[PDB]
Ligand binder design. Structure first.
Ligand SMILES: CCCCO[C@@H]1O[C@H](CO)[C@@H](O[C@@H]2O[C@H](CO)[C@H](O[C@H]3O[C@H](CO)[C@H](O)[C@H](O)[C@H]3O)[C@H](O)[C@H]2O)[C@H](O)[C@H]1O
Ligand SMILES: CCCCO[C@@H]1O[C@H](CO)[C@@H](O[C@@H]2O[C@H](CO)[C@H](O[C@H]3O[C@H](CO)[C@H](O)[C@H](O)[C@H]3O)[C@H](O)[C@H]2O)[C@H](O)[C@H]1O
Ligand SMILES: CCCCO[C@@H]1O[C@H](CO)[C@@H](O[C@@H]2O[C@H](CO)[C@H](O[C@H]3O[C@H](CO)[C@H](O)[C@H](O)[C@H]3O)[C@H](O)[C@H]2O)[C@H](O)[C@H]1O
Ligand SMILES: OC[C@H]1O[C@H](O[C@@H]2[C@H](O)[C@@H](O)[C@H](O[C@H]3[C@H](O)[C@@H](O)[C@H](O)O[C@@H]3CO)O[C@@H]2CO)[C@H](O)[C@@H](O)[C@H]1O
Ligand SMILES: OC[C@H]1O[C@H](O[C@@H]2[C@H](O)[C@@H](O)[C@H](O[C@H]3[C@H](O)[C@@H](O)[C@H](O)O[C@@H]3CO)O[C@@H]2CO)[C@H](O)[C@@H](O)[C@H]1O
Ligand SMILES: OC[C@H]1O[C@H](O[C@@H]2[C@H](O)[C@@H](O)[C@H](O)O[C@@H]2CO)[C@H](O)[C@@H](O)[C@H]1O
Ligand SMILES: OC[C@H]1O[C@H](O[C@@H]2[C@H](O)[C@@H](O)[C@H](O)O[C@@H]2CO)[C@H](O)[C@@H](O)[C@H]1O
Lengths: 68, 68, 68, 68, 68
């Protein structure tokens, strides 16, 4: 499902090396290392991202994301 | 063949780690990890890309792309 | 704890491959390779970063950081 | 030898994972993956590059390049 | 010691995978792969870099650098 669509409010590198982004008031994290620079680049340019996952409650993990 | 030439409309990181880009109204995906940052950079800067592949219908894979 | 929140005044690549950033007048270092490009991008763009660690005195290590 | 010195006219990711650039009307390819993002950045900012190799005819391989 | 401080005049990817930068009229090289994208980004944006090493003559190696 499309869990959230919006700008990245903040991003955060976590101690376990996962990466959290806050979109549409909800936080989601991913363990895919390659998405770190891609998500930060979207954040910097103010691009809209769509967090895609089976679980959409805040604090959930995701591994799929559309840029624009 | 040159399947599509134009700016990337959107890109998507897939759960299976492949990467999809939509160019000239058609979607294409690649499994080449090195293309991910090159494609996202082309998207953020509005570079014109030419998706090259023997299969050009929307939903097809590719591994070759020219950046202008 | 939130050790420092501000722009990165300088970053430095160390001989042991760790990376140091100076934020709010204090220096912090991290051994997480993935953070290097993220922290440099933040520095180049003037992003506000929050260094998160249980040890916040100048010269402390960290592995967690929020980008705003 | 200095094979070509000029702006990157176009770059291309090849199916065999090599990367081609066209400079001063000639095509050069490299198998050094680390060069890909460096060459694409030079291309985006319009920086002059000097392709260095012992073989300088169009279609030759290289692994050395000066930026500016 | 602080060997040189200024903008990167040019950078060069070498055949042995090392990376050279020219700062304040002197060339320095490093074998640290991680420094490549950091040094190139510094060069592209005009950041001031300070090359730190015990050997400061042109042609010397380094593995420590500050980005301002
Ligand atoms: C001699 C002719 C026999 C049949 O022709 C081949 O048909 C297949 C269709 O099944 C074609 O395969 C397709 O090739 C394209 C590239 O031309 C794509 O493959 C590339 O991209 C994928 C995904 O990124 C992989 O990286 C492959 O290694 C790439 O080559 C497409 O996914 C693939 O189905 C083939 O081109 C015809 O020659
Ligand atoms: C009397 C109480 C002692 C027990 O508490 C622990 O104390 C130590 C101090 O010696 C704390 O260790 C410090 O933890 C921070 C993060 O909170 C830093 O460690 C992180 O960063 C480094 C460098 O990048 C490494 O990546 C570590 O893996 C990270 O956790 C700091 O460097 C470290 O000294 C500890 O937090 C307390 O629980
Ligand atoms: C010494 C043997 C007699 C002739 O000298 C050598 O001739 C060969 C011609 O086949 C030259 O090989 C060419 O070398 C250049 C660099 O000068 C290119 O090789 C580089 O780039 C490729 C592709 O990226 C690889 O990374 C190589 O490792 C690099 O060295 C070119 O592709 C290659 O054909 C050789 O230089 C002469 O000494
Ligand atoms: O003009 C640059 C060129 O770069 C890429 O091709 C390279 C050489 O130009 C080309 O001669 C060489 O062809 C070889 C293949 O390497 C090999 O895999 C195959 O078995 O034989 C052919 C010769 O028949 O390939 C290198 C790349 O390794 C790029 O593929 C090409 O489109 C063009 O951009
Ligand atoms: O990236 C290349 C290289 O950088 C660092 O080494 C530098 C020089 O390459 C190296 O020659 C030099 O060696 C010095 C020692 O520092 C000094 O203690 C000794 O007495 O004399 C030699 C004289 O050559 O060291 C500098 C760094 O100060 C880095 O240390 C090295 O690992 C490597 O990455
Ligand atoms: O329309 C593009 C899609 O690309 C990816 O899927 C492809 C292919 O289209 C599909 O049939 C196959 O099952 O998986 C491929 C990836 O390995 C994405 O996964 C899709 O979401 C579309 O973007
Ligand atoms: O002037 C800097 C040079 O850096 C690289 O060479 C260094 C060093 O200068 C040289 O003496 C040694 O043999 O190799 C080093 C790299 O491992 C480049 O190879 C040179 O072309 C210069 O750029």
């Amino acid at each position: 499902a499309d869990c959230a669509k919006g700008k990245i409010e903040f991003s955060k590198y976590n101690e376990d090396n996962t990466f959290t982004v806050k979109v549409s008031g909800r936080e989601y994290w991913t363990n895919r290392w390659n998405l770190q620079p891609l998500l930060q680049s979207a954040q910097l340019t103010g691009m809209t991202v769509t967090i895609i996952s089976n679980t959409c409650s805040s604090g959930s993990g995701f591994a799929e994301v559309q840029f624009n």
